[PDB]
Amino acid sequence: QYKLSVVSGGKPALNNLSSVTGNKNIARLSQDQRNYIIPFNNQIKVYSVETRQCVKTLKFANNSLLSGIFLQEEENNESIVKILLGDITVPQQHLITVFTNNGHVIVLNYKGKLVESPKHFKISLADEKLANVFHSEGNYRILTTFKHNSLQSYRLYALTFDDAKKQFEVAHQAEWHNVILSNISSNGKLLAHMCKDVEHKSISVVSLFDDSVNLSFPLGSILSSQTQSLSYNTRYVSSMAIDNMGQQLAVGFASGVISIVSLADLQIRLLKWHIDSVLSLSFSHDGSYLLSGGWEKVMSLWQLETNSQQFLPRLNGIIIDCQVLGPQGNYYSLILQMTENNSNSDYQFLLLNASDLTSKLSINGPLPVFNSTIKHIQQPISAMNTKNSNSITSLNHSKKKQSRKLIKSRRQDFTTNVEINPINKNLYFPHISAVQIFDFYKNEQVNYQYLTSGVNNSMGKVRFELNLQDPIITDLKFTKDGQWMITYEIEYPPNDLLSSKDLTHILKFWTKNDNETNWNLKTKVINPHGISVPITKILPSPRSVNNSQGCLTADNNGGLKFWSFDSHESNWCLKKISLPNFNHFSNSVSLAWSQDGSLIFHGFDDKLQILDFDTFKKFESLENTKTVSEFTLDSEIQTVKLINDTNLIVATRTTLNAINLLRGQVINSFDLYPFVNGVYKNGHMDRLITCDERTGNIALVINQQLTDVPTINYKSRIIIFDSDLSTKLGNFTHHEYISWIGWNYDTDFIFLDIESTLGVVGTNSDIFAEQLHKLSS
Amino acid sequence: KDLASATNYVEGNARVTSGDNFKHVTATTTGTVTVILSQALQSNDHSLLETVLNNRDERVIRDTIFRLKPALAVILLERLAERIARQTHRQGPLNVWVKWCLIIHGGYLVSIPNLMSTLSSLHSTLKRRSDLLPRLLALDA
Amino acid sequence: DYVQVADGLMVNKGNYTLNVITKALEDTTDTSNDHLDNKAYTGSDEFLSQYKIKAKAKVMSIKIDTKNSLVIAILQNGLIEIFDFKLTLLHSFDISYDNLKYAKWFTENGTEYVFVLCPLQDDKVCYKLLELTDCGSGESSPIKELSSTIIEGFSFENSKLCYQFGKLYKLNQGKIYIYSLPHCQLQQVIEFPMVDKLSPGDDLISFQPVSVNRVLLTVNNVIYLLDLLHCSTLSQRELTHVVINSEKSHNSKTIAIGISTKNGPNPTSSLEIINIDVGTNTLKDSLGKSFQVGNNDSSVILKPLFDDKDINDKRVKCNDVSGDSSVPVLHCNEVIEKLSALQDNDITSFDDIFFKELKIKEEHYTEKDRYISDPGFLNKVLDLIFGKFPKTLTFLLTHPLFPLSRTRNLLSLLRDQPRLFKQAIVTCPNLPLNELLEELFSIRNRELLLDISFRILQDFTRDSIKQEMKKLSKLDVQNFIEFITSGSTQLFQLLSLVLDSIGLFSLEGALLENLTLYIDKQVEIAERNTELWNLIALPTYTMEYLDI
Amino acid sequence: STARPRIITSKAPLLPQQTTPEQRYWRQYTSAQLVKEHNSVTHISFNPQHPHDFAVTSSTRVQIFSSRTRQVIKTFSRFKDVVYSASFRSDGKLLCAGDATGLVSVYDSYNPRTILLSINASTHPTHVTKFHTQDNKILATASDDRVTRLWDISNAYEPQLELTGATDYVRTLSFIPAAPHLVATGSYDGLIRLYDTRSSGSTPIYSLNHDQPVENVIAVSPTQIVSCGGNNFKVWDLTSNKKLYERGNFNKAVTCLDYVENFDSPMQSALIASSLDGHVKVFDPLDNFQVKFGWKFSGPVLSCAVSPSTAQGNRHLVAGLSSGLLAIRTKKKRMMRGSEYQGDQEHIIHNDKVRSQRRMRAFERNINQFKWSEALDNAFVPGMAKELTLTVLQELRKRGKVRVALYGRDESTLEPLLNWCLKGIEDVRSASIVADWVAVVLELYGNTLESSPVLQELMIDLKTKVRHEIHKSKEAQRIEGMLQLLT
RNA sequence: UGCGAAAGCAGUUGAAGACAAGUGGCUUGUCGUUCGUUAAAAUGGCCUCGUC
C-alpha cells in the first residue's frame, strides 16, 4: 500500500543561460515592499521580509493546471521566466502573473488560498522563445530568442490583452541578429546588447518603450591601447550594466577592470580593483553607486564621485547577479553560487537592506555533494582554467566534452552522502568542508557549519589560488541516540610542493545539546588507522554496548578499530584495534554490527568475515555445527545489511544475496548485472540501498534512456522488499534520477532526486463591522 | 550573529590525538649504579633520574640494566619514552638506554599478556619519529 | 530457535546438601530428597501417587496426600509438625509455601478453593472449573494455572481474585507443558511434536513451530526464554530457545529423558532413589552468536534461484549495461543435465567435454560474471573432471575462478602440473595456511614461491601465520634464509615474519651474520636508489667581438 | 556577511604524560617560599573555622602564620622542653600544645601571654594531643606512657577517660567523623585500635593490623579510615572491618597524612601524604586511591598540610622538613548620572554590542591583510615562539604560496629562514614543514646559491643536520622493528 | 582520459572554418567557430561598530 510522495523543494532555478542575459535574477518584491516572491524549480515561494518564513507556497503537485504544464516526465523544458506584479486581465486594482519560457502566461490568486483554475494563455507567436518581459504603465514588451556559430537573435514585441479576452497580441518593433551579452536597465526603460559585427565586436544601447536613446559603436573605442595588444582575457567583456537614465554604461572585463563609459561622448573611466573576473555589476537608482561583485566573495559598492568603495567581505559564495530593488534603493539583491563544489549549480538567493548590510532571508536550495556533473552544469567564467572554475577558452570546449562524456561513458552513479538526525528528524548534508542542516518539513535550512580547518571563509578565492582544494568531508555518522557527530574528512596539501604526494585523514567528534543548533568540537583524531590511509566505511553502534555511543571504523586495508566514550575520562578514546595487513587494498570495505551487541559483519571484498566482539578477532568455533565465520561470494561484496538477527542482505559487485545467519546458507539471490556492472564506484551502493527496522529493504533501479543512441534524461525505479527477499511488494518509477534512499526513523523512507527534490515512501452589527473593516483601510 | 552565515570553525579544547597511539585493550659483575635507578623508579624524582640518565658509557649501561630488576623496566622505558618525546636533541644517548632494557630483558615482557596497552606510548613516539623518512630522503636528495 | 544437544520446589531451595531438593516417588512410594535422600517421610499419602511435595527448604516436609493435608511431616529432626488440611483428594499439586503464604488446594478432578499452609487463613473459593487438562503453579500472581482440553484456561489466583488469562481454551493430551523464564508465558505442549510458548496474558502463543526434537519432556531454562526439551525415545536433550547473569545449571528445571532418566536438572547425580549418574553440566544461554551458530528445524530445499526482475514495461527505457543485450546466462536444470551428459559415456573424450561446456553456459573460456554457480553442481563437476580424464583447457580455465569449492584444496599438495599449479596458487580462493606454508618450505626457490608469498600475505592473518609457523621445523627456515642469502616485497615481509617467529635464543651466529651482510648491502642499495627516486650579476669590464 | 576565522594555534599532539586536569590544578601551585626554622618541623595543623592560619611546631617554639601574607605572626615559647603536637579546637579559638615535659598546655589564639590551662599528663612526653571534632570540651592526649587519655577541659583536674590497651608508643589519634563516640588510636606495633567512649574504654572493640608500625591514622569518612606505617599507606573500612586498599609508591616510611573534601577542584576528595624521602604525594580517593601528583623538596619531609575546604583566599600547601626549614607552595584565586542605568523598568531592551576581541597578533593581521612576505618576515623575528612560527608556516603552506612568500628575496633575508630551519628540522612536529620549505627555497634560489657565498655553509650544515636526523630516525625505526619482534 | 589503493596501470595528440598580423599571393598567431577522440601577465587584492 506504499506510495511515493514529493514533499520538499529544490534549487531556486534562475534564468540559467550562457550569458544570454545580464539580469540573471527573476525574483521579485511586491509593490507593498513586504513580500518576496521567488520562483523555484518545484515551488513558488512567497516570503514575508520582517518574519522570514514561507508565508505561503504555491506547490506544483497540488493542482492540475500547471502540473500538466511543467511537471511531466521528459519535456519539462517549460520554466518560469518572469514574475510581473501588475496584473494584465483587468489592471490597476493584487495578483501575480507568471511568464514562462515558452509563454504560458498564468495569473495566480496571490493573496490567500488559490483556486484550482488560474488564468491561462499560451502566447501567440512562440516557436521556441521567451527571454524576459519589460513593463511600464500599461505598455508591455517582450524579448524573444531566435535562430551561424550558435548565437541567438533577439526580437522585441509589444504586447496587450484586451478587446479579445483570451488572446494577447504582439507588434514586432525591432530585432538584432547576434548577441553574446545583453543587460536591462534596473527600472526597465533601456537595454544594451552586443552584436559581434566585423570591424570588431560591437556594443549597442536601445530604448524599448520610446526611441529617445539608441546608439551603437565598436568596442575598440572603449578598449585602450593597453589592451589592444595584450592577452584576450582583458579584451573579454564579462559583464555589463546600464544606469537608470541612459548616459552611464559599465562593462566589466575578465581580467577584472571595470570600464565605465559615458553614452554622450564615448569617453571612459577605469574602476580597477577586482583581481579576478567581474560577474555582477549594476548601477544604483540614480547613477552614483556602481554596486558589483566578482569571483572572490566580496560585495563592493563604489561611489563614483571619489571612486571609493564599501566592502562586504564574505558571502559564503561567489556572486553572479546583484542589483538594487527598493522603491528608492533600500534593498540589495544578491544571487550567490557557492562554487566550492564543482558538482552542482547550487545557488543561494539573499537580499539585504542597505542600513547596516545585515542579511535577510537567505533562500537556498538543498546542497548535495554529487560525485559528477549533472546536466550542462559547467563552472562560471574566470581568468584561469582550474579545478573549481573554467576559463574563457574552455567553455564551449568543456561543455561539448561534458555532454559527450555523459553520453558515451558508463559511470553514471553520482550518488551523494547524507544523514538523518535521530532526535529532531532533520537531514544533514555534507558539503565541501561544511555541513548543512536541512529540515524537509518546512523544506528549508536551519544552519550551516564549517567542520574543518579550511580557508573557505577566511580569504576569497582568486585567480591562481582557485587550484587550491578545500578539505572535503568524506563521511559523517551519528551516534543514533543523537549525541555525537562522528565526522571523518580528508585534507589536501597544494601541489608543486613535496608534501603533495599524500593527503591527511582527520577524524573528529562533535557534540551538542538540543539548545544549540550548531555542534562544538570535542576530540580531533588526526591520522587514524595509520597514516595516509582511508577509512571509507564507518559505523555507530546501536544501543547495546554504550547506549549507542560506540563508533567503530573500518579501513581501506581491511582493518577495524573500535572507539568508545568513557566516564572517568571525559574525552572520546578507543578500546579495540585490529590491523590485518592485506597487501591488496580495496576501498570496498563495509560493516554491519549486530544490534544485540555480539558480532561485526566485516564486508571486505569477497571476504564476509564474522568478528566476535570479546576479542575483536574472527568468530571462534566451539560447537562445530555449521560454525562458518567467512563467506566468499561470487564477486567483491560492497553492501552488508541486517534487518534483525535472522537474515543478512549482502549486495556484491554484480548480484545480491540473502542469507540466514541462524542456518548459514543462501535463502534468496537477485542478480543485478543488467543495471550495475561498473557504473557505480566501489563502495557507493551501500550509500544507495539501505535498511529499515521491520519493513524490508529497498533496491534502486537505475535507467538512462536510449533515444531512437543514449540520452541525458532519466528515470529510476525503487523496489521495496520484505524480510530477506520474500516479495517485491512495491515497485515505483520516478521520472528523474534518484540518488539515495534511507529510513528516516519515523518508519518510512526518504529518497532524493538530482533535480533535487525530496520524497517519502509513504503509507446589522455584522454588516456594520464588515463595512467598517472595508472603509478603515 | 547574522542569520545567513556559516558559523566559524572552533578548536576549543580538542585533544588532538594520533590514531597510532591508543589507551588499552669478588662480586665480579661491575661496580656501578642501578639501585639508585630502582628506588628512583619507585618514586618519580627527575633530579636523580637525570643524574642516572646523563651517563653514556655503554658497558656501564649494560651492567646497570643487567642488575636492574625486570618488573619495573616497563615503566623505566615508559619514562624514557616521555623524556625522548619531550626532547629529541640527545636522542641517541638514551636510545641506547631504551634499547638495552629490551635486549637484556625481553622474554619477561613478552610473557606479559598486555604489551601494547602499557607500551602504547613508546612505539607511538617512535613511529612519530620514523614515519617521515621518505620526504626527508627527498630533502637530502 | 533451537540449539545443540548434549549429555549423550528446587527452584526456591538450596542444593549440595542431604535435603537438597524435593525428589518425587519415581518408581518409589511417597517422597525423598537428593544427596549426591534426607528425612522426607510422608503421611497418609500416595494412594496411587508416584509424585511428592515439599515447602522448598525441608523445614516443613509435605506429601502427595490422599487426605490433602500437605502442610507438615517429618521435616528437620525426623518428627512431625503441626499439619493443616488443604486439599481433599490426591494432593501431588499441593506443595504449599512456607508459612500461611499460599497453598495449591488442588485435586485430581478439577477442585480448587482458597487455603494456606501453616495457619487456616482462607478466603473465598471462586474456582469454577471443569474436567481440566493442566493444573500447575504460576507466579504472575500467586496462582494455580488451570487449563483444559475441554473447557478451562487461566492462572487463577485466590489472593486478589485474579484470573490472568481467562478463557475456555482447548488444549490436548500432552506432557511437556513447561513454564518460561520470563514469567509471562508457559511453554505449552499442544501435541507431541508441537509446542509453543503460550503467553498467559490473554491465552496466546507465539507460533506452533515444528522441530527436530519432538517435545516429550520439556522444562524452562533459568537463563532466558528457552526450554530444555528431550525425547523419551532418545538419549539427548535439545536446548531449544526462543536470570541470565548467573548460569542456568541450577535445580530449577526438571526435564530428563536421556539415558533412562526422569525429571532432573543438569546436575543429575541423584536421579530417583538410588543416586544414578549424571550427564552434561549445562552452561548459560545469553548471546545471539550461539543462535547464528546453530538452529534446528531448518527449511525446504533452498538451492539458489538467481531470480531476475519481472517482465515489466521497459521497452523504450533501454539501458545497455555491459556489452550486449539483456539475455544473460540462465540455466540450472540444463546445467545439471549437461553435467550428467559430461559424466556419461562421453567423459573420456575431451572434444565432448569442450562441447559439453559449450552446451553449458559457455563463457570466453576464462572469466567470472557468468553467474551459473551452485556448490553441489560445482563439486560434482569437479569430481567428474578430476577423476582420471587435467587434459582439457576450456573447462579448467573456466574453473579456477570459482570460490564455492567447499575445502577441496587437499589436492593442491598432491598434484603439480606447472601452469595448472600456477593457476591453482594464484586463483583458487580457499587456501590452507598449513598447506601453503609447507609448499613455501619446499625448496623450489623460484618465482612460484614468490607468487605464493604474495598469495599468503594477500590472504591470511598475521597472527595466525606466526602461530602456524611457530610449530614447524627450523631446517626449512634455515634453508629458506640460505636461499635469501644466495639470491620481492612479499618475500621481505615473510622474512620479517619468520625472523619474528623463529624465537629469541634458538639461533645460530654464522647464518645470522650472512643475513647481516646481505641486509647491509640491501640497505645500502635501498638508500642509494631511493636517492635515485627522489633525484628523478654584471662584471665591470669584458671583451667582446662583433661582425662585418 | 560573516565574522573572521581566528587563526588557530595547532599545539603539540598526543605526547606521553598527557595533561590531566588534576595535575593542572595542582600544577598551578606556584611561588614555593622556603622559610628557615631552628630544628625539625614535626607537626603542622590548620585553623578550622576561619581557614586562614596554620600552626607549625619547631623545637620549644610553636609559631602561627597567616595565609594572607605568609609571614610569622605569633609565637608560643613557654615550653620547658621540645614541643611536639600543635592542634586547634574546632571553633578555632584555642591552641592545644603537647610538649615533652608532660605538662601539656592550652593557650587561646593570638594571646600567648595567657596560658589558659596546663593539663598535667604523665611523666612521659605527651607526644600527640588534639581536640575532639564534634564536641569542643574533650581533648585527647597520647603520651609515650603506652596509654592515652581524654580530658574535659572544664574539669581539667582529672582524666575523664583512661584509654589503655596499646602496647608500644601510642602516637596518633583521630575521631570517626559521624559517630562521636568512636575514637581511633595508633601505636608502634601496628594494631590500629578504636574504642567506644560510652564503654569502659580499656580494650578495643575491634582492632586493625597494619603490619608495619603505624605512623599516622586519619579519618576521611565514617566508613573508611586511612592508616600509614612503613613505605605504604593502607585504607581500612570499618563496616567491612577490613583492609581494602594499599599503595606503596614511596621509598622510606610515610610520615604524615591528611585529607580534604568538597573544596574547589576537579578532584573532589584528596588525600596527601609526606614520606620522609623528599616527596609529598597526593592520592585520589575517588578512583581506587591512585597517585596523581608529587612535589619534591630538598630533604626528608616530616609533615605536610593543605589549606582546608573553605579557605576563601590564598590556598596553601605547606610541608615542614626535618632538616630545619619549611616549604609553602601556594595558589592564589554631576553630568553623567544616568550612564549606569542598565535598563530596569524600561519596556524593550536592545543589545547588539559586539565584544572586543583579544588583540590580534602581528602575523595574524599580516596574513589577514594579505601581505604574505611581510607575514613571513615578521614571523621569523626572534621575539616569537615555536608553535607560533610553526602555525604561520602551516598557514602560508595551506592558504597562500611559499613560492609567493619567497618570490622577492635575496642573499640577506633568506638567511633567518634556514637559521630557524636548522633548529626546526631536528624535532618531531616541525620537520615536514622544514623539509618542503627548504626544498622550495632551494628550488627557487639555485642561481643565487651559485653566486652568493654566505648561505652555502647554511646548506652544508643543513646537509649535516639531515644526516644526523636520518641516522636518528633510522635507529628509531630499528627500535620500532625490535618492538614488533617483542610483540 | 579509463581502471584502481592513498601507488600505479593502459591509451590521447587531429580534420575543417573564420579573423588578425607580417612579408596580389605567401609565413605566424587568436577563436563567447564546426566535427571527431572515453583523452600567469591592465598596480588590482576582503569595511565599520574599544569609544568617551
UniProtKB/Swiss-Prot annotation, chain A:
Family annotation (InterPro entries): WD40/YVTN_repeat-like_dom_sf, WD40_repeat_dom_sf, WD40_rpt, WDR75
Chain segments annotated as coiled-coil in the UniProt record: none
Principal location listed in the UniProt entry: nucleus
Repeat region (WD), residues: 273-312, 468-520, 530-573, 583-623
The keyword Disulfide bond is annotated on this UniProt entry: no
Keyword annotations of the record: Nucleus, Repeat, Ribonucleoprotein, Ribosome biogenesis, rRNA processing, Transcription, WD repeat
Function text: Involved in nucleolar processing of pre-18S ribosomal RNA. Required for optimal pre-ribosomal RNA transcription by RNA polymerase I together with a subset of U3 proteins required for transcription (t-UTPs).
Summary of subunit composition and partner proteins: Interacts with snoRNA U3. Interacts with MPP10. Component of the ribosomal small subunit (SSU) processome composed of at least 40 protein subunits and snoRNA U3. In the absence of snoRNA3, forms a complex with other t-UTPs. This complex can associate with pre-18S ribosomal RNAs.
Extra remark: Present with 6560 molecules/cell in log phase SD medium.
Protein name: NET1-associated nuclear protein 1
Organism the protein comes from: Saccharomyces cerevisiae (strain ATCC 204508 / S288c) (Baker's yeast)
Organism phylogeny: Eukaryota, Fungi, Dikarya, Ascomycota, Saccharomycotina
UniProtKB/Swiss-Prot annotation, chain B:
Coiled-coil zones: none
Domain of life of the organism encoding this protein: Eukaryota
Organism of origin: Saccharomyces cerevisiae (strain ATCC 204508 / S288c)
Role summary: Involved in nucleolar processing of pre-18S ribosomal RNA. Required for optimal pre-ribosomal RNA transcription by RNA polymerase I together with a subset of U3 proteins required for transcription (t-UTPs).
Miscellaneous information on this protein: Present with 33100 molecules/cell in log phase SD medium.
Sequence similarity: Belongs to the UTP5 family.
Compartments in which it is found: Nucleus, Nucleolus
Full-sequence portion shown in this chain: 348 to 545 of 643
Assembly, per entry: Interacts with snoRNA U3. Interacts with MPP10. Component of the ribosomal small subunit (SSU) processome composed of at least 40 protein subunits and snoRNA U3. In the absence of snoRNA3, forms a complex with other t-UTPs. This complex can associate with pre-18S ribosomal RNAs.
Protein name: U3 small nucleolar RNA-associated protein 5
Intervals holding WD repeats: 67-107
Curated annotation (Swiss-Prot), chain C:
Keyword Nucleotidyltransferase: no
Physiological role: Involved in nucleolar processing of pre-18S ribosomal RNA. Also has a role in nuclear tRNA export. It acts between the steps of tRNA maturation/aminoacylation and its subsequent translocation out of the nucleus. Required for optimal pre-ribosomal RNA transcription by RNA polymerase I together with a subset of U3 proteins required for transcription (t-UTPs).
GO process terms (BP): maturation of SSU-rRNA; maturation of SSU-rRNA from tricistronic rRNA transcript (SSU-rRNA, 5.8S rRNA, LSU-rRNA); positive regulation of transcription by RNA polymerase I; tRNA export from nucleus
Keyword check for Nucleotide-binding: no
Location of this chain's protein in the cell: Nucleus, Nucleolus
Keywords: Nucleus, Phosphoprotein, Ribonucleoprotein, Ribosome biogenesis, rRNA processing, Transcription
Primary site of residence: nucleus
GO molecular function per UniProt: tRNA binding; U3 snoRNA binding
Protein name from the UniProt record: U3 small nucleolar RNA-associated protein 8
Subunit structure: Interacts with snoRNA U3. Interacts with MPP10 and UTP25. Component of the ribosomal small subunit (SSU) processome composed of at least 40 protein subunits and snoRNA U3. In the absence of snoRNA3, forms a complex with other t-UTPs. This complex can associate with pre-18S ribosomal RNAs.
Note: Present with 16800 molecules/cell in log phase SD medium.
InterPro entries named among the record's database cross-references: Utp8_b-prop (IPR018843), Utp8_C (IPR053881)
GO cellular-component term (any): t-UTP complex
Curated annotation (Swiss-Prot), chain D:
Record InterPro entries: U3_snoRNA-assocProt_15_C, WD40/YVTN_repeat-like_dom_sf, WD40_repeat_CS, WD40_repeat_dom_sf, WD40_rpt
Signal peptide range: none
Repeat (WD) residue spans along the chain: 36-77, 78-117, 123-161, 165-205, 209-246, 249-293
Principal localisation: nucleus
Pfam families per the UniProt record, alphabetical: UTP15_C, WD40
GO molecular function: U3 snoRNA binding
Keyword RNA-binding in record: no
Gene Ontology annotations of biological process type: maturation of SSU-rRNA; maturation of SSU-rRNA from tricistronic rRNA transcript (SSU-rRNA, 5.8S rRNA, LSU-rRNA); positive regulation of transcription by RNA polymerase I; rRNA processing
Keywords from the UniProt entry: Nucleus, Repeat, Ribonucleoprotein, Ribosome biogenesis, rRNA processing, Transcription, WD repeat
GO annotation, cellular component aspect: 90S preribosome; nucleolus; nucleoplasm; rDNA heterochromatin; small-subunit processome; t-UTP complex
Compartments reported by the entry: Nucleus, Nucleolus
Domain of life, per lineage: Eukaryota
Function: Involved in nucleolar processing of pre-18S ribosomal RNA. Required for optimal pre-ribosomal RNA transcription by RNA polymerase I together with a subset of U3 proteins required for transcription (t-UTPs).
Subunit description: Interacts with snoRNA U3. Interacts with MPP10. Component of the ribosomal small subunit (SSU) processome composed of at least 40 protein subunits and snoRNA U3. In the absence of snoRNA3, forms a complex with other t-UTPs. This complex can associate with pre-18S ribosomal RNAs.
Miscellaneous field: Present with 358 molecules/cell in log phase SD medium.
Full protein name: U3 small nucleolar RNA-associated protein 15
Organism: Saccharomyces cerevisiae (strain ATCC 204508 / S288c)
